[PDB]
Amino acid sequence: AVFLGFLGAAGSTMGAASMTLTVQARNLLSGTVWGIKQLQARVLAVERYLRDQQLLGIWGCSGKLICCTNVPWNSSWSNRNLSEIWDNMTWLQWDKEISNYTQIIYGLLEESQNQQEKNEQD
Amino acid sequence: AVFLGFLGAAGSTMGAASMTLTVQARNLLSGTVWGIKQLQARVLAVERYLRDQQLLGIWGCSGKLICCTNVPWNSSWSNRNLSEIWDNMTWLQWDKEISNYTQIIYGLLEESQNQQEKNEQD
Amino acid sequence: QGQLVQSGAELKKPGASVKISCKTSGYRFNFYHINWIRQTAGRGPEWMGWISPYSGDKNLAPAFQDRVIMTTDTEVPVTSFTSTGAAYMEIRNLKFDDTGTYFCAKGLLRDGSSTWLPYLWGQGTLLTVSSASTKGPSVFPLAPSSKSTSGGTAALGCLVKDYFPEPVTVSWNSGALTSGVHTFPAVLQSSGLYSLSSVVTVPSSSLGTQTYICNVNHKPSNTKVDKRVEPKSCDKGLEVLF
Amino acid sequence: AENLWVTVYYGVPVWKDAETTLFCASDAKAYETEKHNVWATHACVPTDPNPQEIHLENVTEEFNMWKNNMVEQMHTDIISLWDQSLKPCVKLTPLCVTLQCTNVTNNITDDMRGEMKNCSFNMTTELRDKKQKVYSLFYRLDVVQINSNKEYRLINCNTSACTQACPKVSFEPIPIHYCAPAGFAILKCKDKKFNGTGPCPSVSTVQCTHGIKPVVSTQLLLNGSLAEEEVMIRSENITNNAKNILVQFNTPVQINCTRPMNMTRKSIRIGPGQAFYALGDIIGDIRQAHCNVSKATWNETLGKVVKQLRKHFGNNTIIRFANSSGGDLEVTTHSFNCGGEFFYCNTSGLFNSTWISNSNDSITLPCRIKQIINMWQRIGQCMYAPPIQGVIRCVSNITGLILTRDSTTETFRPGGGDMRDNWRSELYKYKVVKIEPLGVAPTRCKRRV
Amino acid sequence: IISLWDQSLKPCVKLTPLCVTLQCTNVTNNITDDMRGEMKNCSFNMTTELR
Amino acid sequence: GPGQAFYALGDIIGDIRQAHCNVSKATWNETLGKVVKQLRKHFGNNTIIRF
Ligand SMILES: *[C@@H]1O[C@H](CO)[C@@H](O[C@@H]2O[C@H](CO)[C@@H](O[C@@H]3O[C@H](CO[C@H]4O[C@H](CO)[C@@H](O)[C@H](O)[C@@H]4O)[C@@H](O)[C@H](O[C@H]4O[C@H](CO)[C@@H](O)[C@H](O)[C@@H]4O[C@H]4O[C@H](CO)[C@@H](O)[C@H](O)[C@@H]4O)[C@@H]3O)[C@H](O)[C@H]2NC(C)=O)[C@H](O)[C@H]1NC(C)=O
Ligand SMILES: *[C@@H]1O[C@H](CO)[C@@H](O[C@@H]2O[C@H](CO)[C@@H](O[C@@H]3O[C@H](CO[C@H]4O[C@H](CO)[C@@H](O)[C@H](O[C@H]5O[C@H](CO)[C@@H](O)[C@H](O)[C@@H]5O)[C@@H]4O)[C@@H](O)[C@H](O[C@H]4O[C@H](CO)[C@@H](O)[C@H](O)[C@@H]4O)[C@@H]3O)[C@H](O)[C@H]2NC(C)=O)[C@H](O)[C@H]1NC(C)=O
Ligand SMILES: *[C@@H]1O[C@H](CO)[C@@H](O[C@@H]2O[C@H](CO)[C@@H](O[C@@H]3O[C@H](CO[C@H]4O[C@H](CO)[C@@H](O)[C@H](O)[C@@H]4O)[C@@H](O)[C@H](O[C@H]4O[C@H](CO)[C@@H](O)[C@H](O)[C@@H]4O)[C@@H]3O)[C@H](O)[C@H]2NC(C)=O)[C@H](O)[C@H]1NC(C)=O
Ligand SMILES: *[C@@H]1O[C@H](CO)[C@@H](O[C@@H]2O[C@H](CO)[C@@H](O[C@@H]3O[C@H](CO[C@H]4O[C@H](CO)[C@@H](O)[C@H](O)[C@@H]4O)[C@@H](O)[C@H](O[C@H]4O[C@H](CO)[C@@H](O)[C@H](O)[C@@H]4O)[C@@H]3O)[C@H](O)[C@H]2NC(C)=O)[C@H](O)[C@H]1NC(C)=O
Ligand SMILES: *[C@@H]1O[C@H](CO)[C@@H](O[C@@H]2O[C@H](CO)[C@@H](O)[C@H](O)[C@H]2NC(C)=O)[C@H](O)[C@H]1NC(C)=O
Ligand SMILES: *[C@@H]1O[C@H](CO)[C@@H](O[C@@H]2O[C@H](CO)[C@@H](O)[C@H](O)[C@H]2NC(C)=O)[C@H](O)[C@H]1NC(C)=O
Ligand SMILES: *[C@@H]1O[C@H](CO)[C@@H](O[C@@H]2O[C@H](CO)[C@@H](O)[C@H](O)[C@H]2NC(C)=O)[C@H](O)[C@H]1NC(C)=O
Ligand SMILES: *[C@@H]1O[C@H](CO)[C@@H](O[C@@H]2O[C@H](CO)[C@@H](O)[C@H](O)[C@H]2NC(C)=O)[C@H](O)[C@H]1NC(C)=O
Ligand SMILES: *[C@@H]1O[C@H](CO)[C@@H](O[C@@H]2O[C@H](CO)[C@@H](O)[C@H](O)[C@H]2NC(C)=O)[C@H](O)[C@H]1NC(C)=O
Ligand SMILES: *[C@@H]1O[C@H](CO)[C@@H](O[C@@H]2O[C@H](CO)[C@@H](O)[C@H](O)[C@H]2NC(C)=O)[C@H](O)[C@H]1NC(C)=O
Ligand SMILES: *[C@@H]1O[C@H](CO)[C@@H](O[C@@H]2O[C@H](CO)[C@@H](O)[C@H](O)[C@H]2NC(C)=O)[C@H](O)[C@H]1NC(C)=O
Ligand SMILES: *[C@@H]1O[C@H](CO)[C@@H](O[C@@H]2O[C@H](CO)[C@@H](O)[C@H](O)[C@H]2NC(C)=O)[C@H](O)[C@H]1NC(C)=O
Ligand SMILES: *[C@@H]1O[C@H](CO)[C@@H](O[C@@H]2O[C@H](CO)[C@@H](O)[C@H](O)[C@H]2NC(C)=O)[C@H](O)[C@H]1NC(C)=O
Ligand SMILES: *[C@@H]1O[C@H](CO)[C@@H](O[C@@H]2O[C@H](CO)[C@@H](O)[C@H](O)[C@H]2NC(C)=O)[C@H](O)[C@H]1NC(C)=O
Ligand SMILES: *[C@@H]1O[C@H](CO)[C@@H](O)[C@H](O)[C@H]1NC(C)=O
Ligand SMILES: *[C@@H]1O[C@H](CO)[C@@H](O)[C@H](O)[C@H]1NC(C)=O
Ligand SMILES: *[C@@H]1O[C@H](CO)[C@@H](O)[C@H](O)[C@H]1NC(C)=O
Ligand SMILES: *[C@@H]1O[C@H](CO)[C@@H](O)[C@H](O)[C@H]1NC(C)=O
Ligand SMILES: *[C@@H]1O[C@H](CO)[C@@H](O)[C@H](O)[C@H]1NC(C)=O
Ligand SMILES: *[C@@H]1O[C@H](CO)[C@@H](O)[C@H](O)[C@H]1NC(C)=O
């Protein structure tokens, strides 16, 4: 078994960092002057957790980790080859380059799910 | 319909306590000196809820109630027969005997999910 | 994983007070059922009935449908799982074919199609249906003998002669010497009185280092004989070792 | 052949022993006793119109009333609420001016020293410079002299600067319920002959406790819930004499306590805004605060109790009774509040007995009244009980004792030294547990491909 | 550190009447004129347990 | 009073001599050299650093 550790694959190649995806999710939650400090932090924890979980829910995924969708890769989103990415780059690098167009993709991945559900049922 | 009540099957045989599993999950959430008390309790509620839900998520289950996995039963985890357990024992008894090796099993049930996902996709 | 206690019983005439009790330990007393069974020398092992301490449902055999009554008591807890209860049985209409040891044995598990099948058994209480009067045991001491001259092994014990009814208990040093003990069955003479023997095997080098006290207890006559067995022998094949 | 596979289960009936942060519950009628926040509730969640209990059939759990947490919790809570109620009220920091006192207006009977005193003092007015010559009366326990002809000072002025309770709040003990958060449970032992500790055979589960009111007193637990079948005693170590012997009742022995003096509340302004509520002259005769208990009923209940002592101290023994050994008022007397004043009642009258067994009458009781209290180790505060105008009569049930014991024979003495035992009296039925619904098991199942 | 600092002093004793005029002298010694006397010995009027 | 308790100093027991601090001269004369050695990597290979 390969267990580099929490965030241990932040500097490894993105393909190699796909191998460790359960460790980061595990420790994300980690379930009177000091009291207000501690409590405030402990609320922002569950809020930061439930925002990303909410998104992962309304994209139809709901299922933890890698999830596919039928959205086409608009090549203008940093056009490189696949071997040019998953054998080379790291996730910080990657999300930096994609950071510009990220929000648009989050918006698109919203709407397509819904129609699927709707007419899927019916 | 059989509705003994919340925790009503804590002293019944584990097979019989499998029959009432939705009632316990339902009431788990139950969605200025007094104020800090009440509020603190109300936060620890959602935290205790989201820890177990987080685990039930990163084991691939995500689906409430009984969930299967491909982990082999290492017989040293209190070797008894099946008829020796699901017709005889109660869940307090059971989790007491299994309490020793519990953590190891939680660790194993982590890692196997991830690989499944990964190569399942691809 | 606990052992069930069974209560020894008096010889009884075709009419007299009849009951036998049974105690418990180390289990949850209200889950497992309670089955009763009786082994006589004329008809074999026969199942009588069973009863659950939680509900109270007794199912008896038609052979005991109108003469045997079964009873259960209330549970006295120890921990969250283990407990300690008891249960009695009164078999009326005492015939002579009822003579012979009989038992208690609880169910196997709490649910299923095999809820009550008797998994955990007891010690054994013995009956003697007889008009014949009680008789006390004549406890004689038996002399040691040579079992092996080259190995240095001997044997010594007690002889329980002419008692009625069965049984007679025989212990050692109030329970200190249990290794090497061999008790033999009692034969019934042509008169109505039994006789058995008993012999523990202990080394020949132990003379003034261990006290041997055979404690023959007979309950129907209320007698406890504490015989001291002499470690000096009379065999000419063991005298070579002393 | 088959190999077993672990399967994951959510919502399994498995708990573990723990403690947590509990919260109150008030009756829907109680939020209509408004009286501008009667002490606890102003901010408390109503109690369910349809409460439920779930009898955990086949279940056995081991209680321990002494090793509880909701007792430590409740005790610290009553203190917190206590200081929180006095934070906005009036502080008596300039009420430590020297006083000039005399005995009260009467045909003195030399034997009685005069339980009250009439005193002139200089007080500051609504302006910081001008002063007054107001007169007020104080009880004997509140004052202490220094030696003009004679003088006095308040007994609190050398210990702690005190605060007066607002005469707006009430001290009435209202039924408070202790409910658990989500994912938590409270276990109710529905066992008649329960001695508080060990495996309770029949257990039920409940979210909130039954209405437990904060009746605070010493040597006598009041207004609580009686035992169901026999007067059962509860003690940590019956052998170790240094442990208090909590006794629960089966019949509520009736007690009627009053203070007959019709009184005056004269509002002495020591400005600005601050308004001391002094006592004024007395209207009517003079006769102390007393308590009445039917002799016959108590002479019968005491027999019922000693009947349960002999099951601890041999089938045939002799149990004498005596009054308190020695100590402060809070320990050696019947410290309690009724209608706004704090009685300290001699307990020597009731404890007159000696137990040799193998018409209309009462046993009258003589109480002193205090206003400046120092309740609690030293952590209540010092607080001035605002004088009550009129005649104060209360009727109460007695439901238990806080006993102590001193080897031919043995005698019993009333204690009540610490306030946690008062909560342990009625909090013995309850324990707190975490809910952990992650039940892993084996079954003959593999996850789909 | 500041918040904890004030929070630790909120329940403690305030010296608001300790600003009474003081009457001081140099400390009890064979003074060496060079040293001014690092300490001072002072009488003052203070309020008692009674105002 | 009341309850408020000022904790004053009282008389002095023993001789009088201020609060002082001791640092080994040699150790400090060496550490200062170790530090100036790292100043010169900022202020030129050969310069003079007074204190
Ligand atoms: C053990 O348990 C017993 C019984 O449970 C308990 O006895 C109770 O004692 C208390 C006080 O000691 C009693 O409370 C008093 O009740 C009456 C009035 O209540 C009724 O009045 C209306 C009339 O229509 C009824 O309809 C209504 O339903 C009520 O039941 C009064 O004597 C008292 O009122 C004054 O005191 C309270 C504040 O202390 C307030 O309730 C009320 O606002 C009054 O305060 C006013 O007094 C000032 C005087 O000048 C006035 O100027 C102010 O405006 C101020 O507002 C009081 O409510 C209670 O009734 C007794 N029990 C029963 C069954 O009646 C024992 O005390 C308890 N043991 C211990 C140790 O506590
Ligand atoms: C608390 O714990 C106790 C003990 O652990 C539990 O009591 C046990 O419950 C189990 C069920 O989970 C019982 O097993 C079943 O037993 C019944 C009874 O056998 C029949 O025969 C008796 C004699 O002939 C007769 O007296 C019985 O009568 C009862 O039943 C009905 C009402 O239900 C009525 O006649 C009476 O009012 C009696 O109550 C009864 O007819 C048996 O029928 C069952 O067999 C079927 O079911 C199993 C699956 O469970 C199946 O595999 C079989 O093939 C068959 O189809 C079953 O064996 C057990 O007998 C109880 N008593 C014990 C163990 O002593 C109790 O339930 C727990 N409480 C809670 C709340 O869970
Ligand atoms: C606690 O102690 C305080 C002392 O500070 C007592 O308060 C005093 O109480 C006495 C009563 O015992 C008061 O004396 C009475 O004063 C009344 C008011 O006097 C005014 O009017 C008269 C003229 O009418 C003026 O001369 C005077 O200056 C005032 O302006 C008088 O009317 C009373 O007179 C009555 O009694 C006398 C007694 O001899 C009769 O002869 C008269 O005919 C008449 O019937 C009386 O003098 C006194 O004023 C109070 N002082 C204060 C500051 O309150 C408390 O009573 C006491 N309480 C207890 C419980 O002990
Ligand atoms: C800071 O300044 C304060 C001033 O307020 C000093 O406090 C005073 O200190 C002096 C000492 O220097 C004290 O004087 C001593 O008082 C003792 C107590 O006196 C009581 O008993 C005597 C009879 O025994 C009564 O007459 C008297 O009324 C008291 O009831 C005396 O016992 C001492 O006498 C000794 O010294 C004299 C010196 O000449 C000898 O001749 C005697 O034989 C004897 O040995 C002495 O008089 C004074 O009481 C203190 N006052 C207060 C208010 O504290 C501090 O000392 C000073 N501190 C510093 C560090 O500077
Ligand atoms: C409460 O009562 C139970 C039984 O009613 C006590 O438990 C027994 O205590 C005796 C000695 O007092 C022991 O010999 C038994 O073995 C105990 N039984 C069990 C099952 O433990 C218990 O000690 C009592 N405790 C208190 C504080 O009164
Ligand atoms: C209250 O204040 C009064 C004045 O209102 C004071 O009366 C003084 O008493 C002293 C004797 O102790 C006389 O020498 C003064 O002449 C009085 N008048 C003054 C000082 O103006 C007194 O201090 C206080 N009396 C009490 C507390 O009984
Ligand atoms: C004092 O004790 C009496 C019992 O003699 C209590 O009266 C009972 O109150 C309960 C409810 O609390 C009722 O269910 C009973 O029917 C009442 N009994 C009778 C005979 O009426 C009374 O409430 C107690 N007072 C308190 C606790 O303040
Ligand atoms: C206590 O004394 C007061 C007097 O201060 C009484 O109040 C009087 O009550 C009667 C009727 O009850 C009224 O007619 C008067 O007007 C009241 N006087 C005042 C000044 O308000 C009170 O009744 C007395 N209490 C008792 C129990 O007798
Ligand atoms: C406590 O007070 C109650 C009520 O004041 C007394 O009960 C009364 O008893 C008489 C009989 O002497 C009855 O006629 C009344 O109806 C009762 N009143 C009520 C409200 O029930 C009781 O006797 C007193 N107890 C003591 C010990 O003084
Ligand atoms: C307990 O009762 C006894 C009486 O049995 C009290 O003893 C008396 O105490 C007073 C002191 O105030 C003495 O003057 C008496 O001589 C004592 N009497 C006897 C017979 O010794 C005792 O004070 C009471 N204590 C408490 C705390 O109530
Ligand atoms: C409590 O009651 C007892 C007795 O009722 C009181 O004891 C009396 O004390 C006085 C002296 O203060 C003696 O003269 C009496 O003889 C005592 N009575 C008896 C019966 O011995 C006691 O003072 C009361 N108060 C306290 C605080 O104990
Ligand atoms: C306990 O009760 C007894 C009697 O009930 C009281 O004994 C009194 O003792 C004195 C002399 O010691 C006698 O003169 C009295 O006649 C006795 N009383 C009676 C009613 O006869 C004793 O004082 C009581 N103890 C306390 C502390 O109150
Ligand atoms: C402290 O108070 C004292 C009295 O305890 C004061 O002594 C007064 O001093 C003045 C001179 O400044 C005299 O005129 C008075 O006769 C003294 N006595 C009084 C006013 O009663 C003085 O005010 C204070 N002394 C200090 C601070 O050293
Ligand atoms: C600071 O204090 C320590 C301890 O008081 C001094 O170290 C001691 O040095 C002597 C040698 O002169 C040794 O014999 C002791 O064993 C040392 N003590 C300890 C606890 O190690 C140290 O010299 C002091 N430094 C300065 C600059 O005064
Ligand atoms: C796809 O990429 C092109 C590249 O210029 C961009 O103009 C276009 O807006 C993108 N598609 C959408 C839907 O935004
Ligand atoms: C399986 O059980 C055996 C029993 O001794 C134990 O030694 C072994 O460590 C267990 N397997 C794992 C992976 O821990
Ligand atoms: C006040 O009462 C005390 C009680 O001991 C008495 O000694 C004193 O003489 C009384 N003073 C009066 C009436 O002035
Ligand atoms: C009770 O007290 C006795 C002696 O006072 C002591 O030996 C024992 O340990 C205590 N605790 C018990 C019996 O649980
Ligand atoms: C009543 O009290 C007396 C003494 O006060 C006692 O001797 C008697 O036994 C009591 N009655 C009963 C029935 O206990
Ligand atoms: C106190 O010390 C000062 C220091 O400058 C000195 O000038 C003064 O004379 C001293 N006063 C005394 C000793 O009274």
Short mmCIF file of N, CA, C and O in Angstrom, two decimals, chain B residues 17-67:
data_model
loop_
_atom_site.label_atom_id
_atom_site.label_comp_id
_atom_site.label_asym_id
_atom_site.label_seq_id
_atom_site.Cartn_x
_atom_site.Cartn_y
_atom_site.Cartn_z
N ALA B 17 -32.66 -6.56 15.22
CA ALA B 17 -32.36 -5.13 15.23
C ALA B 17 -32.04 -4.59 13.84
O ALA B 17 -32.06 -3.37 13.65
N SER B 18 -31.75 -5.46 12.87
CA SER B 18 -31.65 -5.01 11.48
C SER B 18 -33.00 -4.54 10.96
O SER B 18 -33.05 -3.73 10.02
N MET B 19 -34.10 -5.04 11.53
CA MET B 19 -35.43 -4.67 11.06
C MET B 19 -35.74 -3.21 11.33
O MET B 19 -36.45 -2.57 10.54
N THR B 20 -35.24 -2.66 12.43
CA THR B 20 -35.44 -1.25 12.77
C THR B 20 -34.09 -0.54 12.64
O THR B 20 -33.29 -0.51 13.58
N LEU B 21 -33.84 0.02 11.45
CA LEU B 21 -32.65 0.83 11.21
C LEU B 21 -32.96 2.25 10.77
O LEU B 21 -32.08 3.11 10.88
N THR B 22 -34.18 2.54 10.29
CA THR B 22 -34.51 3.89 9.86
C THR B 22 -34.89 4.79 11.04
O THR B 22 -34.74 6.01 10.94
N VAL B 23 -35.38 4.21 12.14
CA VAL B 23 -35.84 5.02 13.26
C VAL B 23 -34.66 5.67 13.98
O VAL B 23 -34.71 6.84 14.36
N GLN B 24 -33.58 4.91 14.18
CA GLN B 24 -32.41 5.46 14.86
C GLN B 24 -31.75 6.56 14.03
O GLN B 24 -31.34 7.60 14.57
N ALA B 25 -31.65 6.36 12.72
CA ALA B 25 -31.08 7.39 11.86
C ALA B 25 -31.96 8.64 11.84
O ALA B 25 -31.44 9.76 11.81
N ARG B 26 -33.28 8.46 11.85
CA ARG B 26 -34.20 9.59 11.83
C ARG B 26 -33.95 10.53 13.01
O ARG B 26 -33.75 11.74 12.83
N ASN B 27 -33.97 9.99 14.22
CA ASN B 27 -33.85 10.79 15.43
C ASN B 27 -32.42 11.19 15.77
O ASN B 27 -32.21 11.92 16.74
N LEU B 28 -31.42 10.72 15.01
CA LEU B 28 -30.05 11.15 15.28
C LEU B 28 -29.91 12.64 15.06
O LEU B 28 -29.25 13.33 15.85
N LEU B 29 -30.49 13.17 13.99
CA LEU B 29 -30.38 14.59 13.71
C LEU B 29 -31.44 15.40 14.44
O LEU B 29 -31.13 16.41 15.08
N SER B 30 -32.70 14.97 14.37
CA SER B 30 -33.81 15.63 15.05
C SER B 30 -33.85 17.12 14.73
O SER B 30 -33.93 17.98 15.61
N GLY B 31 -33.76 17.43 13.44
CA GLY B 31 -33.77 18.81 12.98
C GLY B 31 -35.09 19.52 13.22
O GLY B 31 -36.15 18.89 13.24
N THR B 32 -27.78 35.31 29.10
CA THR B 32 -27.71 34.40 27.97
C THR B 32 -27.02 33.10 28.37
O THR B 32 -26.51 32.36 27.53
N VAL B 33 -27.04 32.83 29.68
CA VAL B 33 -26.35 31.66 30.23
C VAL B 33 -26.85 30.38 29.56
O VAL B 33 -26.05 29.49 29.23
N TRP B 34 -28.16 30.27 29.33
CA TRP B 34 -28.68 29.09 28.64
C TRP B 34 -28.27 29.06 27.17
O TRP B 34 -28.12 27.98 26.59
N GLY B 35 -28.08 30.24 26.56
CA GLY B 35 -27.87 30.30 25.12
C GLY B 35 -26.61 29.59 24.67
O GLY B 35 -26.62 28.83 23.71
N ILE B 36 -25.49 29.85 25.36
CA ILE B 36 -24.22 29.22 25.00
C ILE B 36 -24.31 27.71 25.15
O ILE B 36 -23.81 26.95 24.31
N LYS B 37 -24.98 27.25 26.21
CA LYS B 37 -25.21 25.82 26.41
C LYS B 37 -25.93 25.21 25.22
O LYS B 37 -25.41 24.32 24.52
N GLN B 38 -27.14 25.72 24.95
CA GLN B 38 -27.96 25.20 23.86
C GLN B 38 -27.20 25.23 22.53
O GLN B 38 -27.17 24.23 21.81
N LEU B 39 -26.57 26.36 22.22
CA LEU B 39 -25.91 26.50 20.92
C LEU B 39 -24.75 25.52 20.79
O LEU B 39 -24.60 24.85 19.76
N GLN B 40 -23.91 25.44 21.82
CA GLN B 40 -22.79 24.49 21.82
C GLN B 40 -23.28 23.07 21.52
O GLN B 40 -22.76 22.39 20.63
N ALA B 41 -24.30 22.63 22.27
CA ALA B 41 -24.89 21.32 22.01
C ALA B 41 -25.34 21.19 20.56
O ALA B 41 -25.06 20.18 19.89
N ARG B 42 -26.02 22.22 20.04
CA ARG B 42 -26.55 22.17 18.68
C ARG B 42 -25.46 22.13 17.62
O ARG B 42 -25.73 21.67 16.50
N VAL B 43 -24.25 22.59 17.92
CA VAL B 43 -23.15 22.43 16.97
C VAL B 43 -22.58 21.02 17.05
O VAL B 43 -22.34 20.37 16.02
N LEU B 44 -22.35 20.52 18.28
CA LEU B 44 -21.80 19.17 18.41
C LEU B 44 -22.73 18.13 17.79
O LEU B 44 -22.27 17.06 17.37
N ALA B 45 -24.03 18.43 17.73
CA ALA B 45 -24.96 17.55 17.03
C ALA B 45 -24.56 17.37 15.57
O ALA B 45 -24.33 16.25 15.10
N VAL B 46 -24.46 18.48 14.83
CA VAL B 46 -24.16 18.39 13.40
C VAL B 46 -22.75 17.88 13.17
O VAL B 46 -22.47 17.28 12.12
N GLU B 47 -21.84 18.09 14.12
CA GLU B 47 -20.48 17.58 13.95
C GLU B 47 -20.45 16.06 14.10
O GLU B 47 -19.89 15.35 13.26
N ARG B 48 -21.05 15.54 15.18
CA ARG B 48 -21.17 14.10 15.35
C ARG B 48 -21.91 13.45 14.18
O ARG B 48 -21.60 12.32 13.80
N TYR B 49 -22.87 14.17 13.59
CA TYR B 49 -23.60 13.65 12.44
C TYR B 49 -22.72 13.61 11.19
O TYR B 49 -22.68 12.59 10.48
N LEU B 50 -21.97 14.69 10.93
CA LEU B 50 -21.19 14.78 9.70
C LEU B 50 -19.90 13.99 9.74
O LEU B 50 -19.33 13.73 8.67
N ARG B 51 -19.41 13.61 10.92
CA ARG B 51 -18.27 12.70 10.95
C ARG B 51 -18.67 11.32 10.43
O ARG B 51 -18.06 10.79 9.50
N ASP B 52 -19.72 10.74 11.03
CA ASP B 52 -20.20 9.44 10.58
C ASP B 52 -20.68 9.49 9.14
O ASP B 52 -20.47 8.53 8.38
N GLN B 53 -21.32 10.59 8.74
CA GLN B 53 -21.73 10.70 7.34
C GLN B 53 -20.52 10.81 6.42
O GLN B 53 -20.54 10.28 5.30
N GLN B 54 -19.47 11.50 6.86
CA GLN B 54 -18.24 11.57 6.09
C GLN B 54 -17.64 10.19 5.88
O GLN B 54 -17.24 9.83 4.76
N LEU B 55 -17.55 9.40 6.95
CA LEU B 55 -17.06 8.03 6.82
C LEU B 55 -17.92 7.23 5.85
O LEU B 55 -17.41 6.61 4.91
N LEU B 56 -19.24 7.25 6.07
CA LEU B 56 -20.16 6.54 5.18
C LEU B 56 -20.07 7.04 3.74
O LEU B 56 -20.55 6.36 2.83
N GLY B 57 -19.47 8.21 3.53
CA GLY B 57 -19.24 8.71 2.19
C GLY B 57 -17.95 8.21 1.57
O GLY B 57 -17.96 7.75 0.42
N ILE B 58 -16.84 8.27 2.32
CA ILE B 58 -15.53 7.89 1.77
C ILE B 58 -15.29 6.39 1.80
O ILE B 58 -14.20 5.95 1.39
N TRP B 59 -16.25 5.60 2.25
CA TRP B 59 -16.25 4.16 2.02
C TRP B 59 -17.01 3.79 0.76
O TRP B 59 -17.35 2.61 0.57
N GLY B 60 -17.30 4.76 -0.10
CA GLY B 60 -18.06 4.55 -1.30
C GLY B 60 -19.53 4.30 -1.11
O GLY B 60 -20.28 4.38 -2.09
N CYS B 61 -19.98 3.99 0.11
CA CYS B 61 -21.37 3.63 0.34
C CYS B 61 -22.29 4.79 -0.04
O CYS B 61 -23.09 4.67 -0.97
N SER B 62 -22.35 5.77 0.85
CA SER B 62 -23.05 7.01 0.60
C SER B 62 -24.53 6.82 0.71
O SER B 62 -25.27 7.76 0.57
N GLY B 63 -24.94 5.59 0.92
CA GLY B 63 -26.31 5.23 0.72
C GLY B 63 -26.63 4.74 2.05
O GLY B 63 -25.92 3.96 2.59
N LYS B 64 -27.70 5.25 2.59
CA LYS B 64 -28.00 4.99 3.96
C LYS B 64 -28.50 3.58 4.22
O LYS B 64 -29.26 3.00 3.45
N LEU B 65 -28.00 3.07 5.34
CA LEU B 65 -28.19 1.73 5.80
C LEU B 65 -27.24 0.73 5.26
O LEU B 65 -26.25 0.99 4.67
N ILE B 66 -27.60 -0.48 5.50
CA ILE B 66 -26.75 -1.63 5.18
C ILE B 66 -26.05 -1.40 3.85
O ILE B 66 -26.68 -1.02 2.86
N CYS B 67 -24.73 -1.63 3.83
CA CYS B 67 -23.89 -1.42 2.66
C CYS B 67 -22.82 -2.51 2.63
O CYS B 67 -22.13 -2.73 3.63
#
